[PDB]
Amino acid sequence: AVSDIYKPFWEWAAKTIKERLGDDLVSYPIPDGYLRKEAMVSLAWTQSYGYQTKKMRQIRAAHVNGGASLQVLNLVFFPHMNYDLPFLGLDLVTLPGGHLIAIDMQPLFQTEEYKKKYAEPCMDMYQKHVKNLPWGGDFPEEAKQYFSPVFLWTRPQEDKQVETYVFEAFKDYINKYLDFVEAAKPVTDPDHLARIRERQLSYLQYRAEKDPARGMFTRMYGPEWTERYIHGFLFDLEEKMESGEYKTGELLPCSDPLNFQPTP
Ligand SMILES: C=CC1=C(C)[C@@H](CC2=N/C(=C\c3[nH]c(/C=C4\NC(=O)C(C)=C4C=C)c(C)c3CCC(=O)O)C(CCC(=O)O)=C2C)NC1=O
């Protein structure tokens, strides 16, 4: 089977991020010791990528490769909390038991107004892709509040379906999301900002505590590295807020040159 089936996914996302965000794009600080992590399982490695703009607090990816039986691309766009933009969540998981694919613009709110603003303009795109990406099935209850009407949840059973149908939805959702980002305007109403902050923290807290990545990273690299990776990078909002680092709509200082390729 394809050993690194998400390498073409990442390469496309990197090219698109770089082109469409241009000079607004700067590196996001990747904590030392979490850029590249390797352990024997064959050699299995985790490669980190991180970026930010004045609208995107954090665009970060974990690309895990431990052979065909263990592949993950976890790519999430986190808006700054002075925007009501949804998250863009792209979880692509390949395990011995098959493929797991979760692609969504995870919403801050489930109101009629929010759905009209962000979900309804995506419905043709959703219906185009869901025809070849059937519903994946049973789904944890607590997570339901964090998914939109255009959630693509599917379990492809052949590599080819990932390389074709999933890849095309992957691209379309990223391009549509960045269209939203381009057009988004800041929120200045303090009441709305307070609610945006609450919903962002709720989502971040759920995934930091409940994401199945915790269990897998723990087996691979142990508990101490895993918790630092999860709370310190993958879902780091609460830490950055509590430490006084996060400032609404402001970039975190980082002088690292932009990187889009594996770092040995
Ligand atoms: C908001 C919640 C949300 C999710 C749960 C994930 C999206 C997601 N990932 C899932 C499942 C899942 N995900 C992984 C593994 C990983 N997922 C990752 O992002 C990384 C980096 C992994 C490994 C290192 C594994 C091993 C499973 C299977 C766990 C199991 O079989 O019990 C599931 C199904 C979980 C289940 O059935 O219980 C979802 C929905 N992303 C999200 O945004």
Residue numbers in the entry: 3 to 43, 50 to 272
Passage from the reporting paper:
BV IXα is then the substrate for many members of the ferredoxin-dependent bilin reductases (FDBRs) that catalyze a regio- and stereospecific reduction of the tetrapyrrole pigment. However, during the reaction, a second aspartate residue gets involved and likely serves as a proton donor for the proton coupled electron transfer to the A-ring of the tetrapyrrole molecule. This reaction catalyzed by PebB is a formal reduction of the 2,3,31,32-dien system of the A-ring of 15,16-DHBV. Here we solved the crystal structure of the PebB homolog PEBB (nuclear encoded proteins in eukaryotes are denoted with capital letters by convention) from the eukaryotic cryptophyte alga Guillardia theta. The eukaryotic mGtPEBB is a globular single domain protein that shows the characteristic FDBR α/β/α-sandwich fold with a central antiparallel β-sheet, flanked by α-helices.
The substrate-free model of mGtPEBB was used to determine the structure of the mGtPEBB–DHBV complex, which crystallized in space group P21 with two molecules in the asymmetric unit. Both chains showed clear density for DHBV already after molecular replacement, even though chain A had overall higher B-values and somewhat lower occupancy of the substrate. Electron density for the vinyl groups defined the orientation of the substrate in both chains. DHBV is bound in a niche formed by the central β-sheet on the proximal and by helices H6/H7 on the distal side of the substrate. Although Asp-219 coordinates a central pyrrole water molecule, Asp-99 is in direct contact with the substrate and coordinates the polar pyrrole nitrogen of the D-ring and the carbonyl oxygen of the A-ring. In our crystal structure, Asp-99 had to be modeled in alternate conformations. Because the mGtPEBB–DHBV crystals were grown at pH 8.5 and appeared in similar purple color, the observed alternate conformations most likely reflect this deprotonation of Asp-99. Contrary to this hypothesis, we identified a flipped binding orientation of DHBV in GtPEBB based on strong density for the vinyl groups. This results in an inverted positioning of the A- and D-rings. In addition, although the ligand adopts a planar conformation with three of its pyrrole rings, one pyrrole ring is tilted out of the plane.
